[PDB]
Amino acid sequence: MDKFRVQGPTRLQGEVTISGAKNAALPILFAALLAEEPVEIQNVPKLKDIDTTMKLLTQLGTKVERXGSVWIDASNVNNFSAPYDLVKTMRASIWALGPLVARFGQGQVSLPGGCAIGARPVDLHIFGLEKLGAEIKLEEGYVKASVNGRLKGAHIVMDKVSVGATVTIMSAATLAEGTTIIENAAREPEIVDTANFLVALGAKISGQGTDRITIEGVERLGGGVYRVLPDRIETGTFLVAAAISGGKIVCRNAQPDTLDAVLAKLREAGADIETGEDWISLDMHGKRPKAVTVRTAPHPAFPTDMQAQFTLLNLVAEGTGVITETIFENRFMHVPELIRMGAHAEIESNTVICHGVEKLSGAQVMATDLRASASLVLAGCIAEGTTVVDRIYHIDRGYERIEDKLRALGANIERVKGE
Number of shown-chain residues binding ligand EPZ (CB under 6 A): 24
Task: Name the 3-class secondary structure at 136.
Answer: strand
Report in angstroms the alpha-carbon separations of 125 from 5, 130, 145, 168, 170. 40, 9, 11, 6, 10
| Closest distance to ligand EPZ from the beta carbon of 329 (Å) | 7
162 lines the binding site for ligand EPZ (CB under 6 A) = yes
| Closest distance to ligand EPZ from the beta carbon of 86 (Å) | 14
| Contact status, residue 253 vs residue 18, Cβ threshold 8 Å | yes
- Of 12-20, 81-89, 162-170, 407-415: span binding ligand EPZ (CB under 6 A): 162-170
Binders of ligand EPZ among residues 178 to 197 (CB under 6 A) are 186
User: How do 364-366 and 351-355 pair as beta strands?
Assistant: unpaired
- Measured from the CB atom, is 123 or 384 closer to ligand EPZ? 123
For the chain, helix (H) and strand (E) counts, in that order, are 14, 24
- Of 74-82, 158-166, 169-177, 245-253: span binding ligand EPZ (CB under 6 A): 158-166
DSSP string, 325-339: -SSSTT--THHHHHH
172 lines the binding site for ligand EPZ (CB under 6 A) = no
120 known ligand binder:
yes
77 known ligand binder:
no
- Measured from the CB atom, is 100 or 250 closer to ligand EPZ? 100
- Of 76-84, 163-171, 357-365, 406-414: span binding ligand EPZ (CB under 6 A): 163-171
- Measured from the CB atom, is 141 or 276 closer to ligand EPZ? 141
Cα–Cα distance for residue pair 324/346, rounded to 1 Å: 12
Q: Which of 115, 251, 354, 381 is catalytic?
A: 115
Closest CA to 105 of 127, 139, 66, 132: 132
Q: Give the H or E element holding residue 274.
A: strand 272-275
Handedness of CA 60, 66, 70, 76 (dihedral sign): negative
Handedness of CA 106, 110, 113, 115 (dihedral sign): negative
Task: Name the 3-class secondary structure at 293.
Answer: strand
91 known ligand binder:
yes
123 known ligand binder:
yes
73 lines the binding site for ligand EPZ (CB under 6 A) = no
- Measured from the CB atom, is 333 or 383 closer to ligand EPZ? 333
Q: At what angle do helices 22-31 and 189-201 cross, to 10 degrees?
A: 30
327 known ligand binder:
yes
Whether 115 is catalytic: yes
Which residues have CB under 8 Å from 140's CB, separation 6+?
A: none
| Closest distance to ligand EPZ from the beta carbon of 9 (Å) | 28
Binders of ligand EPZ among residues 274 to 333 (CB under 6 A) are 303-305, 327-328
Closest CA to 147 of 172, 167, 165: 172
369 known ligand binder:
no
What is the side-by-side strand order in the sheet with 81-82? 81-82, 106-110, 142-146, 135-139
Cα–Cα distance for residue pair 344/341, rounded to 1 Å: 9
- Measured from the CB atom, is 164 or 217 closer to ligand EPZ? 164
Binders of ligand EPZ among residues 345 to 404 (CB under 6 A) are 370-371, 398
- Of 29-37, 131-139, 155-163, 352-360: span binding ligand EPZ (CB under 6 A): 155-163
- Measured from the CB atom, is 155 or 160 closer to ligand EPZ? 160
Q: Tell me the Cα Rg of the chain.
A: 21
21 lines the binding site for ligand EPZ (CB under 6 A) = no
109 known ligand binder:
no
- Measured from the CB atom, is 241 or 327 closer to ligand EPZ? 327
| Closest distance to ligand EPZ from the beta carbon of 21 (Å) | 9
Cα–Cα distance for residue pair 359/266, rounded to 1 Å: 19
85 known ligand binder:
no
Write the interaction track for ligand EPZ spanning residues 115-144; mark x where CB under 6 A is met and - where it is not: ----xxxxxxx-------------------
Q: Which residues bind ligand EPZ (CB under 6 A)?
A: 23, 26, 92, 119-125, 160, 162-165, 186, 303-305, 327-328, 370-371, 398
Residues annotated in a binding site for phosphoenolpyruvate: 22-23
Catalytic positions, written as ranges: 115
